[PDB]
From Swiss-Prot, chain B:
Positions with a binding annotation for heme b: C108, Y399
Subunit and interaction comment: Homodimer. Interacts with DLG4 (via N-terminal tandem pair of PDZ domains); the interaction possibly being prevented by the association between NOS1 and CAPON. Forms a ternary complex with CAPON and RASD1. Forms a ternary complex with CAPON and SYN1. Interacts with ZDHHC23. Interacts with NOSIP; which may impair its synaptic location. Interacts with HTR4. Interacts with SLC6A4. Interacts with VAC14.
Biological process terms in GO annotation: arginine catabolic process; behavioral response to cocaine; calcium ion transport; cellular response to epinephrine stimulus; cellular response to growth factor stimulus; cellular response to mechanical stimulus; establishment of localization in cell; establishment of protein localization
Protein name as catalogued: Nitric oxide synthase 1
Source organism superkingdom: Eukaryota
Residues of the full protein shown: 299 to 718 of 1429
Keywords of the record: Calmodulin-binding, Cell membrane, Cell projection, FAD, Flavoprotein, FMN, Heme, Iron, Membrane, Metal-binding, NADP, Oxidoreductase, Phosphoprotein, Synapse, Ubl conjugation
Keyword Oxidoreductase: yes
A GO MF term: FMN binding
GO CC terms of this entry: azurophil granule; calyx of Held; caveola; cell periphery; cytoplasm; cytoskeleton; cytosol; dendrite
Protein family according to the UniProt entry: Belongs to the NOS family.
UniProt: L-arginine binding residues: Q171, W280, Y281, E285
Organism expressing this protein natively: Rattus norvegicus (Rat)
Binding, (6R)-L-erythro-5,6,7,8-tetrahydrobiopterin: S36, V370, W371, F384
Subcellular location: Cell membrane, Sarcolemma; Cell projection, Dendritic spine
Length: 407, 411
């Protein structure tokens, strides 16, 4: 019930007590561990509200105060009366910072308390959503000096009036199945790209087309909007040694902005809550560029490098991987767009975990996600034992809207 | 109940039923996952069910389930248990059990090989000099002049827990570590404490960077005794690089035979506390972990210096760059000397085919993702993208406490 985590590189042991406040379930049992699985009423609502306000008032050191009691009373009356309730600005901000604080798959959480929260609860139309989103994009991008931000649309009501950004991130590239048999662009977006097209978009059918936003307000049929091109900061990818790298014609965008997730605060569900920070280099250079089912460029890069691709044991794949990742980091830095390498990010996270243990009694972490997808054991997180559990406020997965939507 | 795992690279979905046969626990609950935690005297009472379950599984695998022979065997084990309180395995059940422990070892990537295992039965062994002799034969058979063969040597089972056989070494072959007076370590930091025990027991330490440790062997609960493995039996590979001629001048070498000797084999409720086993190396074990962990030989700096990488900002990825070259070197050196080794691409690919085969024929393959994914280049290996289910089947290999912590010294 009081749990230890050991760092096997440093022998440092931390005691976790925060897990006892755990609410949601993991997917695991005593008979089976599902640690590597990607996706493992009035009555219900009041406990959730109470649990949240209790932690809020504790955080501002007013636990058991008249204002604590009165707010519980007030929210309680409101749920009874309206079957839902509204968060104060202060609670919304707290809730959102803590959803990030609790994100067990996020290595960058040392930043959790510096989050700019844009309250878009007064939004009513997809055009409004579009405007909020363009402002988020421009604020967060900040001409390359990126600032963490979230934009929070109105909460779910009877679930027939859901706000949703159909896009998986605010900024992503289109994917096109070809008569050729191959895929042009990003293969992960082939389906959403068709949805756009079938909804009206005229695709330029190139390798790196920024997708349009498909925005759904108030349970309505979603609508299309192009993000002003001038707001979408992109980086051409070059290598500081290989002159030929530029000729591959690779670019990526500066702003990683997950937009398909659900923010749960005090039992309330915010189904449109796009958020952004800044990239860790591996996300682009290892995953986006090298996954076989993504841009899958390893083979082309290896050839340009003239490596021995005869035998897997020459480690040509591994050699090409390093160079691609040097090139990503170098290009972002050269253009002064915020980026972090996996060494510095993981080092930060270890420090953040120390802080959270010391200050909060723990830090839920998902080792499978936290360890970078290259050079695992030469980053300190590899050697760090982690306990994974689910705390609220949280970011949660939700089904893609096109399987739900009734048109 | 059916459980599905999906591969996110291929969309291949597999269905696991084998997890239903699992009884032992994971460390996880519905409220906490302990999947990254390294480590999360038996009555007749508990022994017969364990025996029965094992023999049911044995008799099924030989298509003799419910046969007269199956039944006579259950009766014979049962009478042996509550009469002598324990029981002896037939040679065939011992072989079957040691293979299955391997088959079931969820942190093992090399398990496509599980049915090709040479089982050496050392249960007639009685003394530490006897153990030394068995261990030498294992080393020599397994080494096979570089053409490595998987083997396990199985010493007598636990009885009262006061007469345990134990190999005090953590692997049969490993290099000494020496903590220096200035605080630096010579040799391998992982083996400092053990190297200190050896010295205390009377080993004369060469005190270099790669001194093969002596075997410290406990027979029948007796104080352990030292022995030197004949040097001619210890195959070693000097590490050089195909293109960097200064690489040899780092003075690096490693041994060819990875032979875990501190684990406990459980078969049918019986506990075999000395059961050293060996296969062959995946290159990353040496080139990533043994050479480049900060707590081990820690050669990244000296290698990157020689390569003259930009070392002032980690975002040059100088570490990653040196890491690849070192791993190239390890594989190149083993191949050149004709000593068996597998690269992490080849091994993870084979594992994936192993795993799908196991899902089809067996109903599952328990696998620990944290351990299966290699410690470099994780996501360009197919395992990274493979969902896995981790659960515990018997027969199995288990951890046990280091014997210097529990041993009652005779003097
Ligand atoms: C400040 C810079 C940040 C860094 C360097 C960072 C780092 C990361 C990385 C590397 C991932 C894994 C991405 C993947 O494999 O797809 C991740 C996941 C995540 N981060 Fe962050 N993060 C940052 C900011 C944020 C912000 C601002 C939030 C929310 C306010 C957040 C919430 C999350 C969540 C919820 C996930 C899991 C998403 C999923 O399951 O796909 N992070 N973080
Ligand atoms: C034939 C070639 C083999 C290969 C390439 C191989 C590969 C590996 C690797 C790379 C590890 C992880 C080692 C570490 O991080 O310390 C491992 C773990 C393991 N393998 Fe194998 N293996 C092989 C044979 C065997 C054999 C013969 C057995 C026993 C009969 C075995 C049982 C295990 C066990 C129990 C572990 C977990 C070790 C631990 O928890 O410390 N493997 N395997
Ligand atoms: C099957 C496995 O859970 C899946 O590949 C995970 C592994 N670790 C990951 N880690 C991160 N950060 N992001 C991912 O998408 C994944 N994919
Ligand atoms: C804390 C963490 O569980 C620990 O570092 C594990 C990670 N994965 C591993 N994987 C393998 N094969 N071997 C190991 O020693 C480890 N160490
Ligand atoms: N830095 C972050 C968090 O905000 N990334 C979130 C997901 C982005 C994805 N990993 C990608 O490579 O596009
Ligand atoms: N290939 C195997 C199993 O036979 N490895 C066992 C552990 C070897 C350890 N990783 C080492 O580097 O010494
Ligand atoms: Zn688990």
């Amino acid at each position: 019930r009081f749990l230890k985590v050991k760092n096997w590189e440093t022998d440092v042991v931390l005691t976790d007590t925060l897990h006892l406040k755990s609410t949601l379930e993991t997917g695991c049992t005593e008979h089976i561990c599902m640690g590597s699985i990607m996706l493992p009423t009035k009555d219900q609502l009041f406990p959730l509200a109470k649990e949240f306000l209790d932690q809020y008032y504790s955080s501002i050191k007013r636990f058991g105060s008249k204002a604590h009691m009165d707010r519980l009373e007030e929210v309680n009356k409101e749920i009874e009366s309206t079957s839902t309730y509204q968060l104060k600005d202060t609670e919304l901000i707290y809730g959102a910072k803590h959803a990030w604080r609790n994100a067990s798959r996020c290595v960058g959480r040392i930043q959790w308390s510096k989050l700019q929260v844009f309250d878009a609860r007064d939004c009513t139309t997809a055009h409004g959503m579009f405007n909020y989103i363009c402002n988020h994009v421009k604020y967060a991008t900040n001409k390359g000096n990126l600032r963490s931000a979230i934009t929070i649309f109105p909460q779910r009501t009877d679930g027939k009036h859901d706000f949703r950004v159909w896009n998986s991130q605010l900024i992503r590239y289109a994917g096109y199945k070809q008569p050729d048999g191959s895929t042009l662009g990003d293969p992960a977006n082939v389906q959403f790209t068709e949805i756009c097209i079938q909804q009206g978009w005229k695709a330029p059918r190139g390798r790196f087309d920024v997708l349009p936003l498909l925005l759904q307000a108030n349970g309505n049929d979603p609508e299309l909007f192009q993000i002003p091109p001038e707001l979408v900061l992109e980086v051409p990818i070059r290598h500081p040694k290989f002159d030929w790298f530029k000729d591959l014609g690779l670019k990526w965008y500066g702003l990683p902005a997950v937009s398909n997730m659900l923010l749960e605060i005090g039992g309330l569900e915010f189904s449109a809550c796009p958020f952004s920070g800044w990239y860790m280099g591996t996300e682009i250079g290892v995953r986006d560029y090298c996954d076989n089912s993504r841009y899958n460029i390893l083979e082309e890069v290896a050839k340009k490098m003239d490596l021995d691709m005869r035998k897997t044991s020459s480690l040509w794949k591994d050699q090409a991987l390093v160079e691609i990742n040097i090139a990503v980091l170098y290009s972002f830095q050269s253009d002064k767009v915020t980026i972090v390498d996996h060494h510095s990010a993981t080092e930060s996270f270890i420090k953040h975990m120390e802080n959270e243990y010391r200050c909060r009694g723990g830090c839920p972490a998902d080792w499978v996600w936290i360890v970078p997808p290259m050079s695992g054991s030469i980053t300190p997180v590899f050697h760090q034992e982690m306990l994974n559990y689910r705390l609220t406020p949280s970011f949660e997965y939700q089904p893609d809207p096109w399987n739900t939507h009734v048109w």
